[PDB]
Design an enzyme around this catalytic site. Structure first.
Site, PDB file in Angstrom:
ATOM      1  CG  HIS A  46      -2.173  -0.905   0.957  1.00  0.00           C
ATOM      2  ND1 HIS A  46      -3.466  -0.501   1.199  1.00  0.00           N
ATOM      3  CD2 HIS A  46      -2.262  -2.181   0.496  1.00  0.00           C
ATOM      4  CE1 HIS A  46      -4.305  -1.478   0.898  1.00  0.00           C
ATOM      5  NE2 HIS A  46      -3.595  -2.508   0.469  1.00  0.00           N
ATOM      6  CG  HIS A 173      -3.665 -12.246  -1.902  1.00  0.00           C
ATOM      7  ND1 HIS A 173      -4.816 -11.884  -2.577  1.00  0.00           N
ATOM      8  CD2 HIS A 173      -3.128 -11.127  -1.218  1.00  0.00           C
ATOM      9  CE1 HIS A 173      -5.000 -10.580  -2.299  1.00  0.00           C
ATOM     10  NE2 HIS A 173      -4.043 -10.118  -1.554  1.00  0.00           N
TER      11      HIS A 173
END
Ligand code: HEM
Ligand SMILES: *[C@@H]1O[C@H](CO)[C@@H](O[C@@H]2O[C@H](CO)[C@@H](O)[C@H](O)[C@H]2NC(C)=O)[C@H](O)[C@H]1NC(C)=O
Ligand SMILES: [Ca+2]
Ligand SMILES: [Ca+2]
Length: 357
Positions: A46, A173
């Site tokens: 991010h 993930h």
């Protein structure tokens, strides 16, 4: 060079990262690939991705530590929901290890966190990013409900990432869970082995969905193949974006190409991360401090396998040009619960500090 602990490092500037790695491990990670580690890895992405070639410098500076430097701005954008916890956990280290910039801190912390995950590669780590920047603009963070076209464009605009590198980055993930996608449940894993950096996520997203871990009306979420949960052991959640990338003509064969290909997956992830970690900087102006990143935990070397209650008959294949490997299935008539804690228990709260975010 040689640091005050006998450690012979490449450059003297790298010495400061040794006491930081120890502090991070002892204080928030505890040498495991748990809750705090997962959150820091997410922060790394991010912080770095908020940059735009088309919009120019005023849009954001990439991997600049902006989330830590301007804690009341970006953390509050809808797409950054839940990022607050990692920012507040890292701020204390910024204040303490004050010779290291907020930007370097974020990237290094992610490299340290990842090394606690069995099977993860030893990331390249370059240091020297400036401790000054601007707060980024809203809209540069990809979301679960975005289309593949939108996702691919975003990554291309951020740093010229090819579709291959985009899927490679999604290997993260394999050690990820969700806390905000569905407000009724917490820590819903993206794969059956959230504490192991393996290829299960690529296999499990290709299975037919049979239900939902919690509510069935959440933006950016689709049906899961292993929805069963009990107590703290939440069921597997599946994001629309992961599902979409697994089946789009542009990325389908790449996604399948990682199933049961551990070394290939890890190497490709390391490469993509090298580019991501320096967005907004010229790598020729950063010092190589890679020899200071902890050696990663080794995996067992076992192949990927279908979890109990699923099998080859449950696959929804989209790559026409590649043969799907022959994998075994774990015995059992019903789905096994996915452990909430790395030690197997249901009680293992990670350290959390209060802060400005
Ligand atoms: C198309 C891009 C991506 C999308 C749409 C996306 C979306 C998400 C979503 C919705 C969550 C759940 C957050 C929550 O509700 O708590 C999540 C978690 C996470 N993602 Fe991604 N992701 C993307 C790319 C990546 C990349 C490139 C990385 C890092 C290299 C990454 C690392 C993580 C990690 C480690 C978590 C787990 C956090 C935790 O367990 O607390 N993601 N992602
Ligand atoms: C990078 O910038 C931050 C933000 O201004 C600096 O953080 C301060 O550090 C001192 C100790 O050196 C603390 O007493 C302050 O409270 C910190 N401020 C905040 C808002 O946390 C940091 O020192 C700077 N580091 C470098 C290497 O330049
Ligand atoms: Ca940033
Ligand atoms: Ca995994």
């Amino acid at each position: 060079a040689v640091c005050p602990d006998g450690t012979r490092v490449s450059h003297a500037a790298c010495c400061a990262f040794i006491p930081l790695a120890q502090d991070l491990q002892e204080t928030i990670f505890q040498n495991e690939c748990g809750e705090d580690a997962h959150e820091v890895i997410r922060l790394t992405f991010h912080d770095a991705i908020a940059i735009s070639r088309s919009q120019g410098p005023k849009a954001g500076g990439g991997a600049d530590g902006s989330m830590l430097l301007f804690p009341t701005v970006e953390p509050n954008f809808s797409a950054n929901n839940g990022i607050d916890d990692s920012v507040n956990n890292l701020i204390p280290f910024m204040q303490k290890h004050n010779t290291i910039s907020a930007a370097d801190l974020v990237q290094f912390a992610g490299a340290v966190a990842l090394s606690n995950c069995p099977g993860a590669p030893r990331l390249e780590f370059l240091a020297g990013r400036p401790n000054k920047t601007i707060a980024a603009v809203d809209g540069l963070i990809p979301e679960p409900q975005d289309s593949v076209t939108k996702i691919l464009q975003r990554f291309e605009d951020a740093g010229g990432f090819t579709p291959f590198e985009v899927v490679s980055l999604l290997a993260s993930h394999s050690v990820a869970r969700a806390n905000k996608v569905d407000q009724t449940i917490d820590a819903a894993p993206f794969d059956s082995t959230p504490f192991t950096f393996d290829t299960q996520v690529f296999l499990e997203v290709l299975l037919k969905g049979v239900g939902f871990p919690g509510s069935a009306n959440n933006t950016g979420e689709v049906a899961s193949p292993l929805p069963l949960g009990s107590g703290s052991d939440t069921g597997e959640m599946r994001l629309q974006s992961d599902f979409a990338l697994a089946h789009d003509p542009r990325t389908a064969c790449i996604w399948q190409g990682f199933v049961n290909e551990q070394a290939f997956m890890a190497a490709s992830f390391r490469a993509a991360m090298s580019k991501l970690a320096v967005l907004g900087h010229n790598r020729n102006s950063l010092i190589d401090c890679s020899d200071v990143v902890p050696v990663p935990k080794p995996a067992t070397g076992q192949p990927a396998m279908f979890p109990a209650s699923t099998g080859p008959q449950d696959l929804e294949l989209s790559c026409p040009s590649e043969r799907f490997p022959t994998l075994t299935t774990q015995p059992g008539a019903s789905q096994s619960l996915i452990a909430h804690c790395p030690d197997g228990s249901m009680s293992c709260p990670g350290v959390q500090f209060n802060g400005p975010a």
